């Protein structure tokens, strides 16, 4: 009776401390990058920000008239439907995947708000091969307690910062089922994003697209 | 709307070239991703620097230093035609280098049915002296006594009275 | 259990359930209240206003 209430109360405070620690980390990382860029500019030096280990990929072309070589990759990316968004560990083994499914998907660097809103609204966990909504921290705790992930904030951190267990967290998240964008795509959507279309890599504009889709 | 971007990049450092030269271009693009893509295409086509072996060290948007002063810009361009080989120089009078680039793209697409890819910007300079100003219409805009009637003056359907369509 | 899905962003109560930290967040902080140091190298300005 009292033991479970005390343990859960202490667990609640522990999550609060972790979330406070994570929030400070994001603020410090953003502030320190700004300070580094400011000092480089003052000295005349050029500062290169680090590569983004995280990418968010949205499938923009349907299941019709797609070559088998490209189809298998979206099967491996769990992009089995149009307007489906997933997190991918951006590395040298993924850059080549996304370069050959350039005409069929779009991707970019998601900021903290994009990841935070996606898991809050579209966050569904794969529990016993079922799509269970992440409606409470105990759902995540029983499914990711081995990797010391206890709450939604812990899951957001493990996804945003690409921690050691990013593969387990990304595989736990059922692919986000995003709606059609509010306001629509561009006039011609299947042209490359650079050439005025809406396909391929788009860097920090994946956020502006995702907010439409949420 | 286009945005002027200063783009600086270099190849990845290696024992052969521990200090590669930093190449900087001033090119116009709607956003940063397009600007970097156009930079890499230009670098490959000029210095044969591979996009794969390179990286981007600095990107900075450029605002017009004096956006409230009327200026005349001369632009060199290498347009691609059926033969894919042309080079022209055009003059535009406006208050922003971005505006002159915007006007040039609209003009070339209107006359020669060009595209963003068929057009490559070669050089943009600000011609400040009426002596170096060449085009007749630009000169007749820099005349001291410029004055002319306003042309093309032009729901609530079913107007009850005839339009004045004059002063 | 969980007959209906409630969006934490639009539900202040569900947000409290999921994230026991939103009760103390302090979103807006005033940090530009000291002498704003205009930090721009002179050589950088020349390179910026080049050509």
């Amino acid at each position: 009776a009292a033991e479970k209430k005390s343990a859960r109360q202490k667990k609640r405070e522990l999550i609060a401390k972790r979330a406070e620690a994570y929030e400070a980390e994001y603020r410090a990382a953003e502030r320190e990058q700004i300070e580094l860029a400011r000092k480089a500019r003052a000295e005349g030096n050029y500062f290169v920000p680090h590569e983004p280990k995280l990418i968010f990929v949205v499938r923009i072309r349907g299941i019709n008239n797609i070559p088998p070589k490209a189809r298998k990759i979206m099967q491996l990316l769990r992009l089995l439907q149009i307007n489906n968004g997933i997190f991918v560990k951006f590395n040298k083994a993924i850059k080549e995947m996304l370069q050959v499914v350039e005409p069929y998907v779009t991707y970019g660097i998601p900021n903290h708000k994009t990841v935070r809103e996606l898991i809050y609204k579209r966050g569904f966990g794969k529990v016993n091969k079922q799509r269970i909504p992440l409606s409470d921290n105990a759902i995540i705790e029983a499914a990711l307690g081995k990797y010391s992930i206890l709450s939604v904030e812990d899951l957001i951190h493990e996804i945003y910062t690409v921690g050691p267990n990013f593969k387990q967290a990304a595989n736990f998240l059922w692919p986000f089922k995003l709606s059609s964008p509010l306001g629509g795509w561009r006039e011609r959507k299947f042209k490359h994003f650079i050439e005025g279309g809406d396909a391929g890599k788009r860097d920090e504009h994946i956020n502006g697209l995702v907010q439409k889709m949420l | 709307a286009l945005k002027e971007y200063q783009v600086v990049g270099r190849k990845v450092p290696t024992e052969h070239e521990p200090v590669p030269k930093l190449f900087r271009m001033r090119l116009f693009a709607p956003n940063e991703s397009v600007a970097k893509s156009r930079y890499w295409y230009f670098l490959k086509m000029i210095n044969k620097v591979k996009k794969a072996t390179g990286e981007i060290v600095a990107i900075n948007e450029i605002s017009e230093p004096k956006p409230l002063k009327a200026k005349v810009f001369g632009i060199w361009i290498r347009y691609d035609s059926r033969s894919g080989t042309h080079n022209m120089y055009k003059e535009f009078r406006d208050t922003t280098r971005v505006g002159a680039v915007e006007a040039m793209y609209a003009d070339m697409a209107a006359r020669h049915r060009a595209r963003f890819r068929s057009i490559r910007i070669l050089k943009v300079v600000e011609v400040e002296k009426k002596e170096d100003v060449r085009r007749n219409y630009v000169k007749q805009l820099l005349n001291p006594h410029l004055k002319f009637p306003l042309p093309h003056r032009r729901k609530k359907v079913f107007a009850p009275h005839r339009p004045s369509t004059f002063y | 259990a969980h007959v209906q899905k409630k969006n934490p962003l639009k539900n202040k109560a569900v947000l409290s359930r999921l994230n026991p930290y939103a009760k103390a967040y302090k979103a807006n902080v005033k940090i530009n209240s000291e002498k704003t140091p205009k930090a721009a190298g002179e050589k950088f300005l020349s390179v910026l206003h080049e050509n």
Binding site: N45, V48 | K21, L22, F23, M25, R78, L122 | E50, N51
Partner: peptide, 18 residues
Amino acid sequence: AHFVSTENNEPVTLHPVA
């Protein structure tokens, strides 16, 4: 991230060639 120095690495401006 990492830092790169421009000391004795002044940037050369480049513009395409006709």
